[PDB]
């Protein structure tokens with residue numbers, strides 16, 4: 001049984017209201033991982049139990065080069081811990097914040113890998129629902145690693161629907177901002193937003209006030225830099241079509257519509273999944289504990305245990321990759 | 325009732341996440357022993373209660389020249405303590421790390437003594453499950469003393485099976501890396517790995533990542549130095565057969581298959597158990613407190629009590645060798 005003192009706790013990689021993520025060393029092997037630590041108290045209060053159990057359940061059976069691999073899922077009396085692959089290259093958000101914009105070529109590389117992962121998830125009836133730059137990390141070679149599966153939905157095949165109002169506001173599809181249910185096409189909209197950010201250096205829609213933001217998402221016409229290629233303009237127009245039935249990827253062939261798009265004309269899709277495409281950017285990390293692609297805001301902070309206030313057991317948190 | 329203050333605490337012999345082992349002097353007699361000290365908090369959190377109770381229960385009834393003898397098992401409000409024979413000669417891991425390789429002759433001596441112990445344990449339906457160089461120590465005369473019985477299973481006769489995924493990764497048998505249950509043949513595989521190490525100066529399989537390691541154990545063909553004897557190659561090929569049914573020692577005659585192997589052609593097995601075989605290496609210790617065959621990393625450290633945070637009683641921890 002895996003416990004807290006099986007790991008050394010080295011650096012804070014990220015923190016939010018959800019909890020915290022820490023660079024750990026596994027004592028027994030000396031190998032480095034990221035550990036997401038969540039307080040059960042917060043999870044229950046927020047009504048996120050089912051979502052968090054689902055996060056473990058999906059990760060236990062997913063295997064794909066561009067999804068983050070789970071090593072352990074374990075828990076204590078007051079905490080839930082995910083031990084997972086450390087994405088040395090950090091978030092795409094980090095890189096785009098520094099570089100401001102990616103070339104169409106570089107965006108195409110990341111985009112092809114995200115499309116590959118979303119095809120795989122959708123084939124297994126999983127809707128990810130949280131595509132954003134913050135959840136798109138890079139491994140040490142510069143390949144995509146999708147992280148944070150805390151808003152996934154299972155059992156969603158072509159035409160099936162979902163009702164939970166969830167996601168990140170700036171990335172929410174217009175149909176989610178309407179009453180009743182929505183389908184898997186929301187993931188393609190999400191790819192639309194991140195592709196737009198990568199090539200245009202800004203969100204297609206933004207206001208600090210969510211009420212204004214959601215009106216923009218529902219109502220505003222997207223704009224493009226004049227210099228963008230016709231097929232990049234076509235790709236983003238198709239992914240960010242407000243009607244999910246008319247959206248690129250929103251038909252019965254799902255990822256195939258996106259894969260066959262003229263923006264990805266140069267891409268051989270079997271090379272993508274086989275990791276044969278060369279990353280344009282290779283993270284220049286020089287050790288296993290190197291956190292240069294993570295914000296100082298987090299890594300400067302000292303690690304500190306929070307004071308707490310019968311069975312408090314969560315299912316799906318006694319998992320090991322060695323055992324299943 | 326035996327207590328903590330009945331002993332002087334002299335030198336740290338070894339430490340891990342499990343707990344610590346200290347060289348102690350029994351105040352009343354002035355005799356020296358090793359004391360393994362475990363924290364109940366850690367044992368409970370790790371779900372190792374049954375394993376630790378078993379460790380005491382097995383040691384209370386075992387008697388064989390090459391098994392470490394338990395003097396006392398006792399407990400405090402937050403600790404469990406094993407007082408046992410101090411193996412002055414240290415671990416085989418220590419000696420092999422220094423010398424790099426043993427001659428086939430010296431490997432044969434240690435191998436014979438381990439086989440004798442494993443025969444004895446298996447005859448009493450005990451599977452040891454943790455055969456490794458770290459657990460193979462030497463007494464002051466140079467004879468084998470198996471230590472650390474914390475992964476034993478009782479009641480395992482010929483054909484009976486076990487389900488717990490436990491052991492040390494580098495020493496795990498291939499069948500343990502498959503679903504469902506495994507038999508007592510795991511111990512002969514374990515002997516295989518230690519014999520290989522002794523004669524070939526490396527583990528037959530190694531990778532720092534366990535996922536890679538387990539694939540090697542399941543899939544990789546073992547290699548031998550060209551100079552190894554035909555019967556050494558044969559012994560190792562037989563003990564390290566991936567199929568437990570085809571493995572040397574894996575039949576209904578158990579240790580007899582191994583004892584009758586041509587590598588041990590020179591061995592009289594009754595002389596082995598009667599300790600009439602001369603150790604090739606005699607520990608050159610010059611006093612009862614001499615810890616030259618223990619790593620400085622441990623013995624340089626000062627002895628320190630850890631701060632803690634109703635009945636917390638463990639059964640099988642009221643044992644004395646004078647009383648049963």
Ligand SMILES: CCn1c(-c2nonc2N)nc2c(C#CC(C)(C)O)ncc(OC[C@H]3CCCNC3)c21
Pocket residue numbers: 013014015016021034036055059068070082084085086087088091134135137147148149150
């Ligand atoms: C700290 C960033 N971060 C990371 C990693 N950081 O380095 N390698 C990582 N992997 N993993 C996560 C997960 C996760 C997960 C699973 C796979 C269990 O679903 N959820 C959330 C994360 O941040 C969220 C916020 C933290 C604050 C800054 N931006 C991102 C993760």
Ligand SMILES: CCn1c(-c2nonc2N)nc2c(C#CC(C)(C)O)ncc(OC[C@H]3CCCNC3)c21
Pocket residue numbers: 337338339340345358360379383392394406408409410411412458459461471472473474
């Ligand atoms: C520190 C080494 N060590 C020793 C001895 N050291 O000198 N004489 C010993 N005996 N005994 C044990 C036991 C035990 C036991 C019973 C018989 C109660 O089952 N478990 C574990 C030990 O280390 C584990 C690790 C410690 C770190 C270095 N390598 C070995 C022992």
